[PDB]
Design a binder for this molecule. Structure first.
Ligand code: ADP
Lengths: 49, 49, 48
């Protein structure tokens, strides 16, 4: 739900229910080897090396 | 046109300079930086309070 | 089977159109099916 380009725009957390709008944020991910990451998650982002 | 989201990943031997270039992009693009390790967590509440 | 998820998609697309209006260039966004992949990015699923 965080990393979905669309659903970040209405991110919500248990403390303050109201949606937040993360749409402009630039997430990045770092993994020592890209394969161990579960398939549904690995498949979205590109695995630059 | 405007910025667009996409997720991306970097991977390679530890200590290749990954995070340093990450921050370099944060000051390249001029966006604000904030690192957030997530190695080995399972308490989803940390991501949502 | 529910329509809530399509309502979220079209919402996101619309709000991006609002962002193209209120500060962006066009005074009248004109969505077309070929255009949509611009707004909401590339299709994810295809192979039913
Ligand atoms: N091409 C490079 N130029 C300058 N410093 C580098 C380069 N490659 C690696 N480093 C240094 O190596 C270290 C590696 O750190 P970093 O990418 O920040 O996280 P990690 O240690 O996980 O790689 C940094 O201190 C960085 O300055």
């Amino acid at each position: 739900e965080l990393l979905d380009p669309e659903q970040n725009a209405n991110f919500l957390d248990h403390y303050l229910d109201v949606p937040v709008d993360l749409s402009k944020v630039l997430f990045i991910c770092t993994a020592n080897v890209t394969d161990t990451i579960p398939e549904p998650l690995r498949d979205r982002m590109e695995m630059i090396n | 046109g405007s910025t667009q989201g996409k997720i991306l990943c970097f991977y390679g031997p530890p200590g290749v300079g990954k995070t340093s270039i990450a921050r370099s992009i944060a000051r390249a693009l001029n966006r604000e930086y904030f690192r957030f390790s997530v190695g080995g967590m399972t308490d989803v509440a940390e991501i949502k309070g | 089977s529910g329509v809530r998820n399509l309502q979220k998609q079209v919402e996101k697309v619309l709000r991006k159109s609002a962002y193209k209006i209120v500060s962006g260039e066009a005074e009248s966004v004109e969505v077309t099916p070929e255009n949509l992949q611009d707004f909401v990015g590339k299709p994810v699923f295809t192979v039913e």
